[PDB]
Amino acid sequence: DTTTYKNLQHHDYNTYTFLDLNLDLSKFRLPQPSSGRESPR
Amino acid sequence: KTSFGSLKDEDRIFTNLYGRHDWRLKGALRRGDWYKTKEILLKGPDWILGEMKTSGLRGRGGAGFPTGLKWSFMNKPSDGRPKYLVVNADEGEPGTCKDREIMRHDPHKLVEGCLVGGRAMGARAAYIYIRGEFYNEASNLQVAIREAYEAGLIGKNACGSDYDFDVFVVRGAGAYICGEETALIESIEGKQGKPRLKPPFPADVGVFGCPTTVANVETVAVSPTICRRGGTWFAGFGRERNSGTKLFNISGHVNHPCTVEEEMSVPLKELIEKHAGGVTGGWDNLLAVIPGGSSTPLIPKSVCETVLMDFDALVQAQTGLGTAAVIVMDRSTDIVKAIARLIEFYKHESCGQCTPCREGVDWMNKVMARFVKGDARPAEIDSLWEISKQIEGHTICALGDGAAWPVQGLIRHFRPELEDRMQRFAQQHR
Amino acid sequence: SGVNNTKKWKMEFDTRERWENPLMGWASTADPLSNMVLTFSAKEDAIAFAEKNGWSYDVEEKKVPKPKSKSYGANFSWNKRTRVSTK
Amino acid sequence: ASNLIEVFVDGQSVMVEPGTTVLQACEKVGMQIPRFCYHERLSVAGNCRMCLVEIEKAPKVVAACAMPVMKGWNILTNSEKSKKAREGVMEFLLANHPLDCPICDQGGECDLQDQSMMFGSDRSRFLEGKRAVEDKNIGPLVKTIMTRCIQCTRCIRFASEIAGVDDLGTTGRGNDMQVGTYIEKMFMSELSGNVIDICPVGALTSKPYAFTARPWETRKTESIDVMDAVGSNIVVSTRTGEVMRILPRMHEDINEEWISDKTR
Amino acid sequence: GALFVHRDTPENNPDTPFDFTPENYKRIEAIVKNYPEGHQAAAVLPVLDLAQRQNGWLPISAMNKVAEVLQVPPMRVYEVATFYTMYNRKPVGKYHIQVCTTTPCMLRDSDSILETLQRKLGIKVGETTPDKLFTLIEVECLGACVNAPMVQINDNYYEDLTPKDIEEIIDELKAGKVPKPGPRSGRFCCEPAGGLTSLTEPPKGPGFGVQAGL
Amino acid sequence: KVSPPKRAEMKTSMESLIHHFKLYTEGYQVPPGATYTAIEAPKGEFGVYLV
Numbered sequence A: 001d002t003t004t005y006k007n008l009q010h011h012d013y014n015t016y017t018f019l020d021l022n023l024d025l026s027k028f029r030l031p032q033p034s035s036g037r038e039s040p041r
Numbered sequence B: 001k002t003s004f005g006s007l008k009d010e011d012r013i014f015t016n017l018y019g020r021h022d023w024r025l026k027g028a029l030r031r032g033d034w035y036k037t038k039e040i041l042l043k044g045p046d047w048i049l050g051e052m053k054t055s056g057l058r059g060r061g062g063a064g065f066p067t068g069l070k071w072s073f074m075n076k077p078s079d080g081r082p083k084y085l086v087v088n089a090d091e092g093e094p095g096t097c098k099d100r101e102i103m104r105h106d107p108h109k110l111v112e113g114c115l116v117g118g119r120a121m122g123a124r125a126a127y128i129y130i131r132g133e134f135y136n137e138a139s140n141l142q143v144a145i146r147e148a149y150e151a152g153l154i155g156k157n158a159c160g161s162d163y164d165f166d167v168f169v170v171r172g173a174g175a176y177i178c179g180e181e182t183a184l185i186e187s188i189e190g191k192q193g194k195p196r197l198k199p200p201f202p203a204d205v206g207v208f209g210c211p212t213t214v215a216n217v218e219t220v221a222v223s224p225t226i227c228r229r230g231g232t233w234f235a236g237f238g239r240e241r242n243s244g245t246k247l248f249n250i251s252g253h254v255n256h257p258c259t260v261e262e263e264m265s266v267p268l269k270e271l272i273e274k275h276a277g278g279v280t281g282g283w284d285n286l287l288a289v290i291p292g293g294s295s296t297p298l299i300p301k302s303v304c305e306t307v308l309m310d311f312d313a314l315v316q317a318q319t320g321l322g323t324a325a326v327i328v329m330d331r332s333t334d335i336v337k338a339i340a341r342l343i344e345f346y347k348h349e350s351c352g353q354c355t356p357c358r359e360g361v362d363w364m365n366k367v368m369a370r371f372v373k374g375d376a377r378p379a380e381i382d383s384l385w386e387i388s389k390q391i392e393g394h395t396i397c398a399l400g401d402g403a404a405w406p407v408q409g410l411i412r413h414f415r416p417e418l419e420d421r422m423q424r425f426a427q428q429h430r
Numbered sequence C: 001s002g003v004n005n006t007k008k009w010k011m012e013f014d015t016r017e018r019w020e021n022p023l024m025g026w027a028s029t030a031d032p033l034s035n036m037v038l039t040f041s042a043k044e045d046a047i048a049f050a051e052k053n054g055w056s057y058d059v060e061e062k063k064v065p066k067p068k069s070k071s072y073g074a075n076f077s078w079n080k081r082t083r084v085s086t087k
Numbered sequence D: 001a002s003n004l005i006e007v008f009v010d011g012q013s014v015m016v017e018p019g020t021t022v023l024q025a026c027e028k029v030g031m032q033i034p035r036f037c038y039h040e041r042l043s044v045a046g047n048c049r050m051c052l053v054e055i056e057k058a059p060k061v062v063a064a065c066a067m068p069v070m071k072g073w074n075i076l077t078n079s080e081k082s083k084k085a086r087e088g089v090m091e092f093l094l095a096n097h098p099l100d101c102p103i104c105d106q107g108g109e110c111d112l113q114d115q116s117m118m119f120g121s122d123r124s125r126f127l128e129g130k131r132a133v134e135d136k137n138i139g140p141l142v143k144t145i146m147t148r149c150i151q152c153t154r155c156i157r158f159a160s161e162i163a164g165v166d167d168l169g170t171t172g173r174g175n176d177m178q179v180g181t182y183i184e185k186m187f188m189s190e191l192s193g194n195v196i197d198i199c200p201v202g203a204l205t206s207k208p209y210a211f212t213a214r215p216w217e218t219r220k221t222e223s224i225d226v227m228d229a230v231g232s233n234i235v236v237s238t239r240t241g242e243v244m245r246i247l248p249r250m251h252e253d254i255n256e257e258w259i260s261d262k263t264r
Numbered sequence E: 001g002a003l004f005v006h007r008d009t010p011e012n013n014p015d016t017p018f019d020f021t022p023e024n025y026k027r028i029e030a031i032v033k034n035y036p037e038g039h040q041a042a043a044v045l046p047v048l049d050l051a052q053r054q055n056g057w058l059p060i061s062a063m064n065k066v067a068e069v070l071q072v073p074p075m076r077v078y079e080v081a082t083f084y085t086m087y088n089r090k091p092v093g094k095y096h097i098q099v100c101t102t103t104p105c106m107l108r109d110s111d112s113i114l115e116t117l118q119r120k121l122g123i124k125v126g127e128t129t130p131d132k133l134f135t136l137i138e139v140e141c142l143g144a145c146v147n148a149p150m151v152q153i154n155d156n157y158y159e160d161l162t163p164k165d166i167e168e169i170i171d172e173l174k175a176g177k178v179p180k181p182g183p184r185s186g187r188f189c190c191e192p193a194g195g196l197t198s199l200t201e202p203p204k205g206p207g208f209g210v211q212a213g214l
Numbered sequence F: 001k002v003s004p005p006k007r008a009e010m011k012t013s014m015e016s017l018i019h020h021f022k023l024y025t026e027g028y029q030v031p032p033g034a035t036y037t038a039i040e041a042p043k044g045e046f047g048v049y050l051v
């Protein structure tokens, strides 16, 4: 219970885990403000 | 109380520091997190800022600036631009591990602190700029953020309040200078990690030109427990103007190098002998200690006997409390080689924008390598002191000061060691 | 970028022929008033000196640089085009 | 005094607009603060650190090229702290600057040499080996000897803002940071000799004006330009009855500080 | 070591085949959505990292492709890639061993770790093994200093390692199975190696120490 | 900034080369003022009035 390590799910992370989580998170986010330009040019 | 230390476990603000207790959201709720956070957000920004001011929490980045005043820099009304909270999870200072430990073992504290600080400033997003080497820590933080979004703690209803907030994680790509405030802002903005000058301050022009506040992970992680448990309690820990708890990393020649949460103003000797198991060979075998991570100078055993662990106490001892990263060196080590390796680190991690830091830290690296070999002369010690005084205070950011200060500490304390090396080299090469 | 060589009024003469020496290839000249830079503290003083010596003069006004608005914070604008992409 | 604030420099009491920098206030009174990276027609960089000056009752020197004066400041331009700051910055530049002055092209035209003689020390404490940077092949007009570059990003700011090509930049970190293109790029636009103008060191020199003359040799005649109906003001630098160089003049209503490649 | 000048070799010309996978296009879209509608150039760093994760190292065609996707100048992309050290501009091995050699790690003897890795792999300082799966480099502080004799292989940290420990980690990597990340030799993450001296008790639950009026 | 440095220092140092170049091209700037310096030369009082 308190005598064992329990971060062991970081062991089975592949090279795309962070970006897959970000892609999964992309649908939970509010619309973002615009600067009024496509780019600073 | 005259003496400080021996912090109670029920007063430890960073429960689950050692990887037990199920770092996910269910374990965070069991240990106490996201509790009365809607009540805090409805209580509002002025109450949170007053809570920070009464707690007297200072930056835990190494900067030392009052967190309440710094966060109350942005209590202005709307401009037209959004506002942002930025969290520094870079943690590039040698000796420092506390941000990594709290991000991989209690990330929901960091997320709740992002939400509370973003509400206190008035903001729409917190960008957590994590270090690029912490891939597993960043993935755990993303798992926690996804769990918070699923539970409804972030996004379009912040814990049931009418506040809208977003939490993003952006990874670095291996630059210690990107732990700096404005350099981190530039790194988020997509340029190189070169710090910008002040003014404009980040509270006026930050990421994307918006008003932003950059805060340490430990600062924002202790933020919601400070709001929840008072702040008179937090000021009750520690001495006056150095208050609360602090994550001390202890590394180097100690029996058990470790990261431990301890009350501020604890003695250095008490901290080492209680949590690190003592110096390898004993307190008599102890030679020197770097109390901050790497930007702070040395303190020998003689002043390490009675020194406390405050910003003010280390300033009195001609040092600083940076990231509270006690690096311990016993008598069986090459102190000149350790300082030269630190100057190697600063040379490799200089961003190269200022001519003082760029050229002078390369010069310091060469001079310190010659000090380690022994082929210098004792006039070059004062020459290096003047080079350090030329670097310090003449740069855009504080990497120049953080590279000048260990040299100054080495010259200040272990000058007969340098002279002994030079005379041994001269007599063995003649 | 230094500006100390301004702020003094110079009087010079019109340039005459500088031809090539047949022997050595040097620059030969025929007029003595070729290197005749004269320094004056004021335009009116230079005008008076030229009129007194009887030379026809062309006087041109001092070209001061215009005062310019400079702000370091414009390099990180939120919406304007002054945002730079490199420090 | 509607939107005018009083600031002192050496006790003098000049009125400036808000947002005026320390360097602009000092030049309004009449003192030219030393600089390497500041240019009045370029964005503020603040990296050369030569413009560090002391404000009265302030423990830290401020960069005059970027710091705006607030109210009632007393700028101590000739103080001991400011002179020490200038000496330290000049020492740091000349530590790794190569001693190429005779084979260089900024003989009397070197801001680094002149500001060294005026504000730096007279000696070097540098007992190490200097760095060296491989050269580039940026074009047939600009010869790049990048060993003597002082990393001031003036060419980068010019080519990004005025020329607007965004081809120059900094690659690397620390003392290894280099200016140029990462790839073998032929930087050839109009208004591209103005990097030769604005480069204070002889890192970017004129390839046609390679080794032919020196500024103390050159007689300067202020004339105008043809083969362009803008009529930009130029200076013809001749020597011994032979046109050696065409430099730009300063006319704020025609061409500002620079000219085009064809007229150069 | 590495030069910040592209030499345009046949293996690294701006015509070597690089393109993103369609799922990587979706990931790039998610990243650009993370940044605001203006300032999409802020996505240069993670998209370049994604290109590196797809391709191994980062060729000049990959840098130009990132620039073309994000409509950013290629010089700015080169600035980012040359500034940051985690971007490999040369082909590295499959595993890319990075040994921290900063002051607390060399206090706890990272030099023995480095020399045993050197004699185990047969490579001198910073080159590649002939079988093209190991590249040994020195790095600065990696953030795990209480676990001072440490190392980073790809995205994993291996900490508190003896010379025989790093030898058997290398043996496991050559065998093929990935070794267990984290600190070995007893400690779980960062606790003292004499038993727990800090928490040692069940944490208090919700509502503990809540101030009145909240 | 007044005397030229030694030739070895000029060939090995940056500030020394800069000062050698400037002293042997432009020369040192004398601050403005006028003096009359008189020296007992063998023929008599030899004076220089320098402005």
Ligand SMILES: Cc1cc2nc3c(=O)[nH]c(=O)nc-3n(C[C@H](O)[C@H](O)[C@H](O)COP(=O)(O)O)c2cc1C
Pocket (backbone or CB within 6 Å): B058, B059, B060, B061, B062, B063, B064, B065, B067, B070, B088, B089, B090, B091, B092, B093, B176, B177, B178, B179, B180, B181, B214, B215, B216, B217, B219, B397, B398, B399, B402
């Ligand atoms: C070279 C350099 C590196 C730094 N690295 C870090 C770092 O890794 N983490 C951090 O939180 N602060 C770091 N800082 C200090 C930041 O300026 C400071 O943390 C930031 O302003 C956040 O303020 P806070 O301490 O009040 O939270 C660094 C500063 C410098 C000059």
Ligand code: SF4
Pocket (backbone or CB within 6 Å): B177, B194, B195, B349, B350, B351, B352, B353, B354, B355, B357, B358, B395, B396, B397, B398, B399, B400
């Ligand atoms: S002091 Fe060094 S690291 Fe900091 S901005 Fe200047 S050049 Fe960059």
Ligand code: SF4
Pocket (backbone or CB within 6 Å): D097, D098, D099, D100, D101, D102, D104, D105, D106, D107, D110, D112, D113, D148, D200, D201, D202, D203, F018
């Ligand atoms: S740029 Fe100036 S200091 Fe450098 S070699 Fe040329 S003349 Fe000398």
Ligand code: SF4
Pocket (backbone or CB within 6 Å): D148, D149, D150, D151, D152, D153, D154, D155, D156, D179, D198, D199, D200, D201, D203, D204
């Ligand atoms: S090449 Fe010249 S203008 Fe460009 S950064 Fe170097 S010194 Fe400055």
Ligand code: FES
Pocket (backbone or CB within 6 Å): D034, D035, D036, D037, D038, D045, D046, D047, D048, D049, D050, D051, D052, D063, D064, D065, D066
């Ligand atoms: S002129 Fe201000 S720092 Fe360069």
Ligand code: FES
Pocket (backbone or CB within 6 Å): B093, B094, B095, B096, E100, E101, E102, E103, E104, E105, E140, E141, E142, E143, E144, E145, E148, E150
């Ligand atoms: S000094 Fe090695 S991980 Fe920090």
Ligand SMILES: [K+]
Pocket (backbone or CB within 6 Å): D106, D195, D196, D197, D198, D199, D200, D201, D202, D203, D204, D205
């Ligand atoms: K030039």
